[PDB]
Design a protein around this nucleic acid. Sequence first.
DNA 1: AGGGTCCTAGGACCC
DNA 2: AGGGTCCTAGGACCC
Lengths: 363, 363
Amino acid sequence: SSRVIVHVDLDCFYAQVEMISNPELKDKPLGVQQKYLVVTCNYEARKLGVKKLMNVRDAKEKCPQLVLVNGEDLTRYREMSYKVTELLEEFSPVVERLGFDENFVDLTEMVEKRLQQLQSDELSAVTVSGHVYNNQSINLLDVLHIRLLVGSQIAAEMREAMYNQLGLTGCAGVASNKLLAKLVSGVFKPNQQTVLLPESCQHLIHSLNHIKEIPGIGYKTAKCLEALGINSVRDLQTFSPKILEKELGISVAQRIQKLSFGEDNSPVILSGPPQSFSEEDSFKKCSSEVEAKNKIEELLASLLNRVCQDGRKPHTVRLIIRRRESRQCPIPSHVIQMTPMVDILMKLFRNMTLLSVCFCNLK
Amino acid sequence: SSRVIVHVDLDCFYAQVEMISNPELKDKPLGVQQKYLVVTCNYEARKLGVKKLMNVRDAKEKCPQLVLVNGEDLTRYREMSYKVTELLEEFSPVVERLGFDENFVDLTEMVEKRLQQLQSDELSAVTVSGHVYNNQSINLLDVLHIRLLVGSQIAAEMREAMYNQLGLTGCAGVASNKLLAKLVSGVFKPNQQTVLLPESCQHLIHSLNHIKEIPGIGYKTAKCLEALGINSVRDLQTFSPKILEKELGISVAQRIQKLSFGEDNSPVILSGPPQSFSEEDSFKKCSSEVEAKNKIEELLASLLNRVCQDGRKPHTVRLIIRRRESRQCPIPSHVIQMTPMVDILMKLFRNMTLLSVCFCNLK
DNA sequence: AGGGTCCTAGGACCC
DNA sequence: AGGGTCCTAGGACCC
Ligand SMILES: [Ca+2]
Ligand SMILES: [Ca+2]
Ligand SMILES: [Ca+2]
Ligand SMILES: [Ca+2]
């Protein structure tokens, strides 16, 4: 029932794609520009004082010597994301994606293969690759330790294979479940990998500086918790289970309190092909008229430049706004094998600072 | 783009299972008893004046010489249902179930195989099996006619294979989509099969005596339609498409009006294993106290006698009532590999003439 | 920002 | 009755 999971995380991802979509961006302070905000920055830009999601005013005032490229189209980032997943699936079929720049892999079949291609002295060579968290000694007699180094060497290959093949540097974190693997990967922040052996566990949850840093405890679940006298991870651990049941509910409170201890029971989900393809247009309360039309038309050009890909096609259409609301309905089947579409999306709008079109229910 | 679909329908199904679960029920007027109502009756019982869903008072007063068996457990009906689907999947992998006693099969690969294992004189033998609807002549030069007899012979085998193998008599209806196939199967009502060739189409939709008889036009969609001056199938055909769009919506009105003409674009859904396993307890406002507990406990005994089957197991639990409402939440994973369950279902009840427990999200 | 994800409670429907 | 089904609009979450 103990596992080995690894968690692979692409570095300043959108920007690292850019330094390969244009070699001249190397050793330059690069930021990626989305409306009037820098969405992410390469490690030259981050030490000149540019910060992720700090306005592009102060991006150019802490670093008026910053270079910028556009990030309002995602295409190159997304393609380069799926080559990452694809590459990791070459190591194991079960890979779970998480946004464009993280992935998990269950290594427990592949660790249990690699321990049965070792005679005695290959086992005596079972070292760590990368760092160990909280600089913990390894008792190479604890099979949980043994397995959690076999997985870390596997993690090295995934990272070097990403480099030698795809050209991406990225961090990896190995640990007995998706949660501790996700928190340990970020520890040694530039390009490297870190493995959480079992006794290090509590040292990684109490190192957090607010329960919002817990994977899965979000914006609303922090508000509720903070209005109960729960701020520290240990508050959330020691708090009454029943009172948590009945302010947050049975599904949340069982889940997030079990998180605070470092527990995560969920398996690695083979994401496979995506569920949906969608696009967004933010504006400063600009759309105030049925020129909602234009952005609906404009968002549907790219979407039809997308939902002809990967050999599948959509059956439902959804229009999302914040004048969130959504209206959806099935695409009339004769359209599935532009413009008549547009009037469908206006039937959804007329049925109701942002407009979005979304194509899902792919078959 | 024309297709051949067949629609197989088990006769007085629950009762026909009974006449095989007990041979002594042959040539007896059999009804199946659910609370104080006869849920269905074999064809001896139906000609003595017993009617499906007429109280078991008048069931025993139009036919005080009726024999009855219990139908408040479904098990034998369900097992015998899936042997039907299984048997039809042996003919084609893509079978769509519909309640316990109907199925569709797409025969368009198997018709297109069988027409390429015919030399000339086997093609000259391509007759109908069963009846033709509206007693229509067959121009054996129209390939749509040709294919819609090849499918009807296939339909014979499914029915005789059901008999010789499973022992069930049942009706079959073949037609170019799931809708006309479903309406034509019921035409010749005792055990037989009927095929709708293309020109017969309108003769089968206008033969209906209210738009509730259309597959998919239900209880609510009839109410709305009837409050617009729509009662006949031709009312619904000729009614304004836009006004239908904006009283019934874009997804309904596009769908059900296209139904009224005999059109159904939806493919045959390979149902595969079921999505959910659930159970129900009706009562005459009896549960009025936390003896809701008992029925929750009682419904969970059978459900755990069920959700250990077919090699899969549930991840979410749902409690349904009508004091519909439902509350669900994920089953804590340590329970997935009774009694602690019961308290979960009471956390759902306390969060709120019927009580039901439902296990789905099977993995 | 701009993408993604699943859950839920209800809504219709079928038999 | 007593089972089943999918859709939808929202709800949370992640990056
Ligand atoms: Ca980074
Ligand atoms: Ca978080
Ligand atoms: Ca019948
Ligand atoms: Ca109907």
